[PDB]
Amino acid sequence: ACYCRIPACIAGERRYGTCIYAGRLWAFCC
């Protein structure tokens, strides 16, 4: 499953991009 996370993905995930949500920038992680 994919999630938006700050500041980085958790171990086992890969960052595919970035999310813009609630006026902040997140890692897009799957």
Return the SS3 of 13: coil
Residues in a beta bridge with 15:
29
Given candidates 27, 28, 29, 30, which one binds Cl ion under the rule CB under 5 A? Answer: 27
Given candidates 7, 10, 11, 14, which one binds a second copy under the rule CB under 8 A? Answer: 7
Interaction between residue 25 and a second copy (CB under 8 A):
yes
Query: If you compute the radius of gyration of the chain from its CA atoms, what whole number of angstroms results?
Result: 8
Interaction between residue 9 and Cl ion (CB under 5 A):
no
Q: How many CB atoms lie within 10 A of CB 27?
A: 19
Provide the binding-site residues for Cl ion, judged by CB under 5 A.
7, 24, 27
